């Protein structure tokens, strides 16, 4: 049973694995711990970009955001090199998705506005998509500090998969905006050893990764079959039994994805 093989992975990596592939017209759902909470980690940066796209005309992408060295409080591979010049909103969306840029994320949260530096607004966005489970309670990097059993800054594989489904493959965004989210995810630089590593070369993979404490490693993806048939793959993992500094394990996600591709191909 596919469920039994996921349990094999949990046992072998001493991990908790959560999987959701939504059903389609020609496939069953794949569900494993799909309604258990897992930390978002950097995965929220993809729907965050969708929020900003949703809320604004595309001309907003050209708005210049200036910030300081003092705004670099989290892993920010792009923003930390542009403190002198600032970055447009479009550049931040790019950085947030393609390089998990945590300062870009923080700036895009402030862009949504309102109490919580934008965290309330973000969660509200997910609520507008039908998601009553997910919650973002802090910015980077504090949103990573939540220990197991604290529901702050968590989602479920089921919730995040269905959010991604609506954003990339559904009608949550107008198709021009959707195209952007998709293109950015298609050119991600962080995802080569996760879901991408588990799918044959003839399948297309776009994704957004996340890594945190307690061995947290997530990847959410949209994949296209050699036929052009698209599916959403959400894979979430932690290794919390090893403590706050348990090693995150990309290969766990890669194996999970391989098992998923075996079912879908
Ligand atoms: O996209 C990825 O997979 C990596 C990305 C890096 C920035 C974010 N991590 C943090 O800010 C702190 C961290 C804890 C443990 C590792 S990095 B995010 O959650 O993950």
Curated annotation (Swiss-Prot):
Subcellular location: Periplasm; Secreted
Record key words, sorted: Antibiotic resistance, Hydrolase, Periplasm, Secreted, Signal
InterPro entries: Beta-lactam/transpept-like, Beta-lactam_cat, Beta-lactam_class-A, Beta-lactam_class-A_AS
Lineage: Bacteria, Bacillati, Actinomycetota, Actinomycetes, Mycobacteriales
Protein's UniProt name: Beta-lactamase
GO CC terms in record: extracellular region; periplasmic space
One BP term from GO: beta-lactam antibiotic catabolic process
Pfam families: Beta-lactamase2 (PF13354)
